[PDB]
Design a protein around this motif. Structure first.
Motif, PDB file in Angstrom:
ATOM      1  N   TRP A  40       9.028  -3.890   0.574  1.00 56.45           N
ATOM      2  CA  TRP A  40       9.015  -3.797  -0.886  1.00 56.45           C
ATOM      3  C   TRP A  40       8.068  -2.669  -1.313  1.00 56.45           C
ATOM      4  CZ3 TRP A  40      12.160  -6.331  -4.223  1.00 56.45           C
ATOM      5  CH2 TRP A  40      12.832  -7.474  -3.746  1.00 56.45           C
ATOM      6  N   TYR A  41       8.505  -1.836  -2.252  1.00 57.80           N
ATOM      7  CA  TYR A  41       7.676  -0.742  -2.753  1.00 57.80           C
ATOM      8  C   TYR A  41       7.442  -0.860  -4.260  1.00 57.80           C
ATOM      9  CZ  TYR A  41       8.251   1.970   1.611  1.00 57.80           C
ATOM     10  OH  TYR A  41       8.232   2.381   2.927  1.00 57.80           O
ATOM     11  N   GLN A  47       4.838   8.694 -10.194  1.00 60.08           N
ATOM     12  CA  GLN A  47       4.119   8.829  -8.929  1.00 60.08           C
ATOM     13  C   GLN A  47       5.023   8.617  -7.716  1.00 60.08           C
ATOM     14  OE1 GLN A  47       0.300   6.639  -8.990  1.00 60.08           O
ATOM     15  NE2 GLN A  47       0.742   6.282 -11.160  1.00 60.08           N
ATOM     16  N   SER A  48       4.470   8.809  -6.520  1.00 64.21           N
ATOM     17  CA  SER A  48       5.242   8.588  -5.308  1.00 64.21           C
ATOM     18  C   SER A  48       5.166   7.074  -5.055  1.00 64.21           C
ATOM     19  CB  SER A  48       4.663   9.387  -4.130  1.00 64.21           C
ATOM     20  OG  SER A  48       3.440   8.848  -3.670  1.00 64.21           O
ATOM     21  N   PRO A  49       6.087   6.527  -4.249  1.00 67.62           N
ATOM     22  CA  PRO A  49       6.108   5.088  -3.954  1.00 67.62           C
ATOM     23  C   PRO A  49       4.877   4.562  -3.222  1.00 67.62           C
ATOM     24  CG  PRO A  49       8.189   6.163  -3.392  1.00 67.62           C
ATOM     25  CD  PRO A  49       7.154   7.225  -3.515  1.00 67.62           C
ATOM     26  N   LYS A  50       4.565   3.290  -3.447  1.00 70.22           N
ATOM     27  CA  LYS A  50       3.442   2.636  -2.785  1.00 70.22           C
ATOM     28  C   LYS A  50       3.969   1.444  -1.976  1.00 70.22           C
ATOM     29  CE  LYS A  50      -0.221  -0.673  -3.595  1.00 70.22           C
ATOM     30  NZ  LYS A  50      -0.717  -1.665  -4.604  1.00 70.22           N
ATOM     31  N   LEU A  51       3.806   1.486  -0.655  1.00 66.64           N
ATOM     32  CA  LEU A  51       4.267   0.375   0.178  1.00 66.64           C
ATOM     33  C   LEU A  51       3.454  -0.875  -0.171  1.00 66.64           C
ATOM     34  CD1 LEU A  51       5.874  -0.839   2.448  1.00 66.64           C
ATOM     35  CD2 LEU A  51       4.068  -0.130   4.031  1.00 66.64           C
ATOM     36  N   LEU A  52       4.134  -1.963  -0.548  1.00 66.56           N
ATOM     37  CA  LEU A  52       3.466  -3.226  -0.918  1.00 66.56           C
ATOM     38  C   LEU A  52       3.519  -4.322   0.164  1.00 66.56           C
ATOM     39  CD1 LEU A  52       4.533  -4.224  -4.604  1.00 66.56           C
ATOM     40  CD2 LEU A  52       2.262  -3.529  -3.868  1.00 66.56           C
ATOM     41  N   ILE A  53       4.714  -4.543   0.699  1.00 68.82           N
ATOM     42  CA  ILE A  53       4.954  -5.573   1.701  1.00 68.82           C
ATOM     43  C   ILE A  53       5.927  -5.081   2.772  1.00 68.82           C
ATOM     44  CG2 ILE A  53       6.083  -7.825   2.018  1.00 68.82           C
ATOM     45  CD1 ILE A  53       4.850  -8.624  -0.716  1.00 68.82           C
ATOM     46  N   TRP A  55       7.937  -6.184   6.788  1.00 67.43           N
ATOM     47  CA  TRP A  55       8.402  -7.312   7.602  1.00 67.43           C
ATOM     48  C   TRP A  55       8.660  -8.537   6.716  1.00 67.43           C
ATOM     49  CZ3 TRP A  55       4.114  -6.894  11.935  1.00 67.43           C
ATOM     50  CH2 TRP A  55       4.373  -5.746  12.704  1.00 67.43           C
ATOM     51  N   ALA A  56       9.209  -8.281   5.529  1.00 69.16           N
ATOM     52  CA  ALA A  56       9.578  -9.300   4.547  1.00 69.16           C
ATOM     53  C   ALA A  56       8.466 -10.041   3.819  1.00 69.16           C
ATOM     54  CB  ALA A  56      10.516 -10.327   5.187  1.00 69.16           C
ATOM     55  N   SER A  57       7.376 -10.362   4.515  1.00 62.16           N
ATOM     56  CA  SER A  57       6.301 -11.132   3.894  1.00 62.16           C
ATOM     57  C   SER A  57       4.867 -10.707   4.179  1.00 62.16           C
ATOM     58  CB  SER A  57       6.453 -12.598   4.302  1.00 62.16           C
ATOM     59  OG  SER A  57       6.306 -12.736   5.712  1.00 62.16           O
ATOM     60  N   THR A  58       4.669  -9.622   4.915  1.00 60.19           N
ATOM     61  CA  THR A  58       3.304  -9.207   5.219  1.00 60.19           C
ATOM     62  C   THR A  58       2.797  -8.156   4.231  1.00 60.19           C
ATOM     63  OG1 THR A  58       3.707  -9.626   7.570  1.00 60.19           O
ATOM     64  CG2 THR A  58       1.769  -8.314   7.012  1.00 60.19           C
ATOM     65  N   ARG A  59       1.698  -8.465   3.548  1.00 55.68           N
ATOM     66  CA  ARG A  59       1.096  -7.555   2.566  1.00 55.68           C
ATOM     67  C   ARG A  59       0.328  -6.393   3.205  1.00 55.68           C
ATOM     68  NH1 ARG A  59      -2.809 -10.680   0.523  1.00 55.68           N
ATOM     69  NH2 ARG A  59      -1.900 -12.699   1.143  1.00 55.68           N
ATOM     70  N   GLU A  60       0.403  -5.216   2.577  1.00 51.99           N
ATOM     71  CA  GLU A  60      -0.338  -4.041   3.045  1.00 51.99           C
ATOM     72  C   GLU A  60      -1.805  -4.223   2.668  1.00 51.99           C
ATOM     73  OE1 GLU A  60      -0.866  -1.339   4.614  1.00 51.99           O
ATOM     74  OE2 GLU A  60       1.116  -1.129   5.476  1.00 51.99           O
ATOM     75  N   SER A  61      -2.652  -3.331   3.174  1.00 53.25           N
ATOM     76  CA  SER A  61      -4.082  -3.374   2.911  1.00 53.25           C
ATOM     77  C   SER A  61      -4.411  -3.272   1.422  1.00 53.25           C
ATOM     78  CB  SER A  61      -4.779  -2.244   3.683  1.00 53.25           C
ATOM     79  OG  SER A  61      -4.479  -2.324   5.071  1.00 53.25           O
ATOM     80  N   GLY A  62      -5.332  -4.117   0.966  1.00 57.91           N
ATOM     81  CA  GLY A  62      -5.744  -4.106  -0.430  1.00 57.91           C
ATOM     82  C   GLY A  62      -4.782  -4.686  -1.457  1.00 57.91           C
ATOM     83  N   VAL A  63      -3.564  -5.028  -1.054  1.00 60.09           N
ATOM     84  CA  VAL A  63      -2.605  -5.585  -2.002  1.00 60.09           C
ATOM     85  C   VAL A  63      -3.002  -7.013  -2.403  1.00 60.09           C
ATOM     86  CG1 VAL A  63      -0.195  -6.214  -2.403  1.00 60.09           C
ATOM     87  CG2 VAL A  63      -0.756  -4.184  -1.026  1.00 60.09           C
ATOM     88  N   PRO A  64      -3.120  -7.281  -3.714  1.00 58.80           N
ATOM     89  CA  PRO A  64      -3.495  -8.614  -4.213  1.00 58.80           C
ATOM     90  C   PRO A  64      -2.489  -9.705  -3.842  1.00 58.80           C
ATOM     91  CG  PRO A  64      -2.603  -7.306  -5.960  1.00 58.80           C
ATOM     92  CD  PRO A  64      -2.872  -6.355  -4.832  1.00 58.80           C
ATOM     93  N   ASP A  65      -2.981 -10.897  -3.501  1.00 63.36           N
ATOM     94  CA  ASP A  65      -2.073 -11.973  -3.113  1.00 63.36           C
ATOM     95  C   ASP A  65      -1.225 -12.536  -4.250  1.00 63.36           C
ATOM     96  OD1 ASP A  65      -4.040 -13.548  -4.399  1.00 63.36           O
ATOM     97  OD2 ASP A  65      -4.905 -14.197  -2.502  1.00 63.36           O
TER      98      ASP A  65
END
Ligand SMILES: [Co+2]
Length: 112
Positions: A40-41, A47-53, A55-65
């Motif tokens: 999910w982006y 702006q350019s896209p930001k990777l959010l999640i 492998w379907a459910s794993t959050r990237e660094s710093g992404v709020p739960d």
């Protein structure tokens, strides 16, 4: 391989919750690694896209739960709890199951 998203647009008030769907034309699950290759982006105004999640459910660094990804196979969902003004953006799902990755059309999120 087509990636379908819904709804097309959402207008909610601050603090509310939203759920958006992403359906793949083919299963994105790999039994050898046991991972669903669906990401999910978040794309903010100009702006350019930001990777959010990934492998379907794993959050990237710093992404709020507040952001939660779920699903497997062909049907996926991205949920945003207590939506904030900063979350204003267009959200895209992307499959990386095949050589050439594919993006969905996105779901526009606006805050009233
Ligand atoms: Co992925």
């Amino acid at each position: 391989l087509v990636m379908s998203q819904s709804p097309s647009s959402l207008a909610v008030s601050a603090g509310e919750k939203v759920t958006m769907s992403c359906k793949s034309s083919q299963s994105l699950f790999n039994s050898r690694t046991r991972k669903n290759y669906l990401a999910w982006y978040q794309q903010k105004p100009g702006q350019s896209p930001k990777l959010l999640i990934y492998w379907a459910s794993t959050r990237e660094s710093g992404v709020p739960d507040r952001f939660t990804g779920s699903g497997s196979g062909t049907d996926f969902t991205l949920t945003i709890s207590s939506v904030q003004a900063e979350d204003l953006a267009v959200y895209y799902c992307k499959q990386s199951y095949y050589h050439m990755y594919t993006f969905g059309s996105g779901t526009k999120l606006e805050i009233k």
